[PDB]
Design a protein around this ligand. Sequence first.
Ligand SMILES: [Zn+2]
Ligand SMILES: [Zn+2]
Lengths: 180, 186, 592, 598
Amino acid sequence: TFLTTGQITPEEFVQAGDYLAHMFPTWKWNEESSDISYRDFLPKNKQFLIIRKVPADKRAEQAIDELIQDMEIAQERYYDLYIAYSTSYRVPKMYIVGFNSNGSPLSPEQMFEDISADYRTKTATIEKLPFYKNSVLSVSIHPCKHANVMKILLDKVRVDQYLIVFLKFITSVTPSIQHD
Amino acid sequence: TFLTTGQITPEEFVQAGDYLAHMFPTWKWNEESSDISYRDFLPKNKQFLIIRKVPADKRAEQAIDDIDELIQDMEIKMAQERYYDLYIAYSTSYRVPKMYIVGFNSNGSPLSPEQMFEDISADYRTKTATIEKLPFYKNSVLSVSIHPCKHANVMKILLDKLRVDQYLIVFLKFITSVTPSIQHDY
Amino acid sequence: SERVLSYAPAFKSFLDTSFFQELSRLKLDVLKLDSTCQPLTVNLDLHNIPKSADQVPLFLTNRSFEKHNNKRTNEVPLQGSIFNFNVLDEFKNLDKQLFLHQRALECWEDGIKDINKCVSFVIISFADLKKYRFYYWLGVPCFQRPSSTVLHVRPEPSLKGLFSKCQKWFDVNYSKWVCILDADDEIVNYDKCIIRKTKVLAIRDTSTMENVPSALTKNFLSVLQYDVPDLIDFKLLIIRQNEGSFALNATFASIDPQSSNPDMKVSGWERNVQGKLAPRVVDLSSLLDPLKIADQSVDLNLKLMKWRILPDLNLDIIKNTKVLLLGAGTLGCYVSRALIAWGVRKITFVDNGTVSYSNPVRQALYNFEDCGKPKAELAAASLKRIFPLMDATGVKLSIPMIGHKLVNEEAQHKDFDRLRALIKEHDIIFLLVDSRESRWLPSLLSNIENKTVINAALGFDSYLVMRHGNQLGCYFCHDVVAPTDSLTDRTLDQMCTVTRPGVAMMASSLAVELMTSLLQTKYSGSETTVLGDIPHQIRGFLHNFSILKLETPAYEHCPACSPKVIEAFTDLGWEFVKKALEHPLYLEEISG
Amino acid sequence: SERVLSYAPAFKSFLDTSFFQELSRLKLDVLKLDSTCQPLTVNLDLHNIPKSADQVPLFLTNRSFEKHNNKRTNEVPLQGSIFNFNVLDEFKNLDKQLFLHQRALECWEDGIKDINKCVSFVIISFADLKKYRFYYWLGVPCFQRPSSTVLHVRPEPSLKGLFSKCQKWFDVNYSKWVCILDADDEIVNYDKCIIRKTKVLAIRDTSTMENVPSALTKNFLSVLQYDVPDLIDFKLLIIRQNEGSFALNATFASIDPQSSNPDMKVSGWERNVQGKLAPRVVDLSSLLDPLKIADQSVDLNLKLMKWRILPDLNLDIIKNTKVLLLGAGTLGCYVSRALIAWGVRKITFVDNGTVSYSNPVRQALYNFEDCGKPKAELAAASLKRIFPLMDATGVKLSIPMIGHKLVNEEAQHKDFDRLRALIKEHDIIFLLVDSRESRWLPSLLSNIENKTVINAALGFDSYLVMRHGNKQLGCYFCHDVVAPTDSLTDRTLDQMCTVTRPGVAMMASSLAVELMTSLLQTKYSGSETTVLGDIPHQIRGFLHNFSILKLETPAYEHCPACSPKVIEAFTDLGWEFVKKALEHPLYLEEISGLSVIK
Ligand SMILES: [Zn+2]
Ligand SMILES: [Zn+2]
C-alpha cells in the first residue's frame, strides 16, 4: 500500500506517530489548546507531533547596548521541530522553529544557515505554522517529491516506523541539529 | 509682428477685442465678478469675451417615469432650436485665442456634452474637440473646447490672405467653420 | 382694424448649470426641510434677443443669487425670487394659479406706489440632489385689474419718429419700464397728473413678436387705469430695441363691469416647447455627476481611436463582452486593467486564494493593507475603486487540478457546477491559472459551452498566449514545448516557477489585444481584422526580445476537446470528470 | 573532602514569538497604566533537558498566560508572573535587588504554609510595540533565610538505590518539589514532624551541572530550618531524571548569626550568554512586523530566481538603482510597478499635471477618488500603499517643450535647475514624457550628467524603447525615428494628443524595465549579452502583427541634443543657450551644424 505509493492515510499517521512517540518519548503529540486550528480528519489530540529545543552546535554548511550596560547589576542553537500531515501530498510535512544561545527566537534568515545547501535554495520556505490559530513564523520543507524520497529509502533490506525512516531523511536536511 | 506669426500678445488680445465689442456690440467683455478665477497678465475686466444665446436651427451634419406621469398632472389645462453661449479666452501656452461653447436646448435648459458635439463640424470634432470646464470660473461649468493644438498655423494662413484690431474678427471667420450651424452674429 | 389687444409671454427662461450648482450648495447647507424663499436678480439684455426667440432671455446663473452682482450699460435689472421646496409633494400640490395670483398682488401693491416697480418673476423648484434632477417652473405675474377691462386697439403709424427718443430714453433710464410725453412731446417719467392731460404712454417691451406686446403690458395698464379711472382713449407706444416698435390708438373697454373691490386676472406661468403649461424637469447628471462625467470622458477616449484612426472599429462589442477571468494572480490583475482601458464593463474574477505579503509588488490590484484578505472579491473591489461603474464581481472558488485525488466530493461538486455556470453566463473566458493541471477542467467546459478561450501561461522568461476559438487546437491538443527544449522554456506553466516581472505584463497586454482584435469582423479570405492579425498562438521570450506566432490543428486524441472526450462528458456528466481528475490514464483511453 | 555548598541557576529562559505576540494582542500600549501584573504558568519537563544547557528550559509562549490549560503527564507546573512596564525609564530604574527580594518574601509566606509552593519565577518587561523591540529579564527568587546560614556538604555514596524510587516518586507527584523518608525508609510527603526524626530530604533538582544543585535548593532548606531549627545534620538527596542524581551529608552552619528578626539573602536574576547580570533586548521585527515580513518575502521571491535559475544574476545592483521617472502617465505608472516587482527601492516621479477623469482606466496608479489631485505626489503615494518600505517621492515640475515661447522665465528657469538636480541625483533616468518636444532638454541634461537614459515613446499601435548614454550609439534625436513617408499609424509615435491602444503602453513599460535590469548586469567576454539576455540599443514593437524589431543607430555629428557643438554651447552658456533653443529652435540646428547641411 504505502510502500508502493510512498504515502500514508491519516489513520496510518496516527500509527507511526504513536510509535515514534513511544520509541523516542522525546517526541510528543500536541495537547488540546484553544490556539490550535484543528483538522476534522485527525483526532483533536493526534494533530501534530512535536520535539522541543534540540541543540544545534554548528551551522549547516560546516557540519540599547547602553541601556543593557546601565542596567547591568557562532554560538549554540536550539530547535523546536514539528511534524504535521500534508493533505495534498499524502505524506508527513516538516516545520522548524529556532532559538539562539540566549533562548530568543532566530530570524528567518538565521534559520536558513541551518538548512543544507541544496535544500536551502531549492526546497524550503518561510511559513506560518499552519496548525496554530494566530500564528508563528518558521522554516518549512516542501512535501514536493518526498515520495519519491520515502519510497526510495523505504525499499531497504512495517508501517509503524514510517516516521523513523522519514526522520533520518530529515537529518539530511538539517544536519547540524543533533540526532539519535 | 503678429501677421508674421499669426499670434498675439496679452496686450494685443485686449485691442483686437476692444475693437470686436465696439464693432459687434453683441460680444461683451466679462464683468468684474467674484466667481471668476482671475489671470494677472490681463486686466480684471478684460479677461475674456462673451456672446450669449446665439441660435443654431439645424445641426452641423446638415448645415421610473413617473417624471413624465408627474409633469402631466402638475399641468394646468422648430425643436430643438438650440442656443449657444460662446466665450473667447486667451491661451498662454500658445499665443492664440481659444474658444469655448456652452449650449442650451429649445426649452432653454443645458445640453449634454454628447448633444453639443452634434454642432461641431465632423472634421474639427474628431481631431480638435474636447470637453472642459470654463477655466475662468471657479465653481465650474462643462463646455466643449476648441483647442490649440495648431491654430496659426490656421490663423497665419488666413493672414497669408491690416492692423491688429481686427485679429479677432478674422478668428471669428475661422470659428464659424467649426460650428457652421450657429448663426453668424459675428 | 380694429382689434382686441392680445399679448406675448414676457420672458424665455434659460437655466445655466451654475444656477443648479449654487442651488445645491445652499440646499446642502440646511437640514430643516421647510420650504424657503430667496430674492433673485437677472440683468436683461433687450438689445440681444436671439432671432428665433419671441421674447427676451431670462438667464439664471449662480450669480442670480448674489443680490445685484454689478451690471452693464443698457441692461435692465429684473428683481425676482425663488421658492425652493424640499418635499416633492409640496412642489406638486401647490395651487399654481393661487400662487401666481398672490405674487401678482405684491406687484400690484408695489405698482401703485411706483408704476416702474410692478414687474417681477418667480421660480418654484424641487432639487433631487442624489439623482442630479431639478424641477422648476418660471412664473411672470402679469395682471389685468380689474379683469373686466380689456383694450381695443388700432394702428397709429403717425407717432413713428418718437421711437428713437424712447429707445434712447430707455437705454439711459435702465430702472424704468414706462415713460410719457409732456406738453411739448418730450419724454419724461410717468406722472398721473401729466398723462391725464397728455394721453401718451410708452412701454419698454420684452417681446419681439410682430405687433404683439409682452404680457407685462397688462400690469402697466392696470396701474394706469387706477391712477386715471376716467381715461378712455390714449396713444400707446410699444418700444423695442430692434426695428419692430409700433404705436397703437388705444381704448379701454369693459366686459362685465362690477360696481364698487376690483378683482384680478393673472396669467404668466411659462410653457414648455410642447406648448403645455407644465413644470420643467431636468437631468443634469451628465453635466454635474462626477461618476457620469468620467464614464463620458472614457467613452470619448475610445471613440477618438475610432474617429481619428480606425473608423471601422467596433468599440461596443467590446464594451458588452462579459469577461470571466479565471485567476486573480499576476495575470488576472493586468489583463483586467487592459480590459477596462478598452471599455469592458462586466468582469468577473475567480480565485480560491488569499492576498499574500509578496503579492502586491507583482499583482497590480492589491495594496499592502490587503494582505490576508480573499483575492477574488478584493480584486473586483479594486476595479470598482478605479472605475465605480464597473460590474466587477469576485467569486472565491477552487478549481480542481487534474492528477489529484479529491478532498471533498460534495464541496468540489459544488465548485464544479458553480464553475460551469459562471462560464455559460460569460462571453469570453481568460484562463489565467498557475499551472496546467488547473487548466484542464476550464478548457473542457469552455469547449462544451462553445466559448472563446484566451489562455495565458508563464515561464521564467517566456509566455504563451492562445485562443481555442468557437478547427484550431486547444491548449491541450499538442505539447506546448518539446521535452528537448531549454530548461527555461520548460518552466512554461509550472506551478513552482518564479518569473521575470515583465513576462506577466507582456502576456497580459497581448492576451487583451488578441481579444479585441478577435471580436472584430474578419476580412475576406484572410485571418486579419481592422486591428490586425488574429494569430492562434503567440509565444514570446525576454532574453532575446522575440515573438513567435503559430498555429495548431485540433487533435483527434486530445484529452480536452477530442470528440470522444466530449461524448463521454455530456453522457456521464460529473461522474466522468471525477474519474478523469483522479485517473488520468483513464482519460487517455477515452481520447485514444 | 568537605565543601561549602554552591548552586547553579535554576532555569534557562526561552522566549517564543507567541509570547511577545500575546503581549501585543492584550493591547497594553493602548492602556494608560504605568505597569501591569499578570500571572504566568509554564510546565517544566525535567526529562528533556538539552545537553548544552545546565538547567531546565523555562519556555514562555502565548499559552503561558492561560493559567490552567492542559498539562502533559509528569510535567511540573511552575507559577510565575510578568510585570510589564509602559515607561522604559521605570523599567530601567527599577531597583532589581529590592524587587526580587519582594518576590522572595512571597515565596517565603507561601513556603511556610506549604514547602512545595516556595518556588516561583518573574518576568519584568518593556515592550517597544512599534520598533518590535522587547526588553525582558527573568528573575528566579532563591533565598537563604536567614542570610547567616550556609551549608557544609560531603559526598554520600551510600544512598544509591533511593534515586530510582525518588525519580519515580517525583514523576507521579508532579506538584511536589520535596519528599522525605519516614521511619521505614519509605518515600513520603514532606512533614516537619517526620523529618525532625528521620532527617532525610530529597529535592527535585532543576540543574544538570555535575554535583551542583539548582539554587531553588536554598528556598527549601530555608523552610526546613524554620520547621526544624534544632537540625544540624541530615542527608540531602539531589534528584534528577537522568543519571546524575547525588546524595550528600549536609550540615547547617552559620556565618555572623543575628540575635536569637531574620533577614534574608536573595538572588536569581538570570544572566546572558556573556555571563552578565543584565536584561535581554530583542528585535522581533523580522518575525512579527508585517512591513519587515513582506519586505523580506519580496526579496526571497527575487533570490529564488538567482538560486534556481540565474546564479550569477546581480539582484543587488538593481535594488539600489535610483530611478527617476520623467512622466507619471500611462508609462510612468506601469514602469514603476515593474520596477518594484524587480525590487527597486528609490523611485522619484516628475510630472506637472493632475489626475483627470479619463486617467485611472489607463494609468495604473490612480483611482476614481483621486481625480483632480496632483499626479506626481499621488503616484509616489500609490507606490507606498503597495509597498510602504518604498522611498517613493513625487515632484510637481514642468518640463519645457522645445519650440514653445516661455510663459514665465524665472519659474521655468527654476524648473530647469531643479530638473538637472534630480537628474544628477539619480542613476537611471526614464523618459516617459508625452511628446518629443519634451524629450529634448532632459535628453541633453542626462547626456551632460553622464546618465543612462531609457526613452519610451508611443504611437497608436506601436512603440519605441531605447537607451542613451554609458562603440558610440547616439541618442533619441540623432536619427529621425520615423520617416515622413511612413504610414499614418507609425507616424503617431510620440505625438501628443494621440490616443494609443491600451496594450501598447504595457508592452513598452515591461520591455523598458527588462532592458534596464539587463543593462545593469555585467556583459559577457566579447559578446553583447548579459546573464539576462541581449541589451539592444532600440526595440520597436507593432501590435497589428504582434512583432518586435531590434536595431542600433550611430551617434550623429549634427545631432541637436548630442553634437559636440551642442555640448560645447551648453557647457559654457548654460541657461541662456537653453532658453534660446527652446524658443527659436532653428538656432539649435544653426549650432549643431544641421543648418549647414540643408
Ligand atoms: Zn484539444
Ligand atoms: Zn544625439
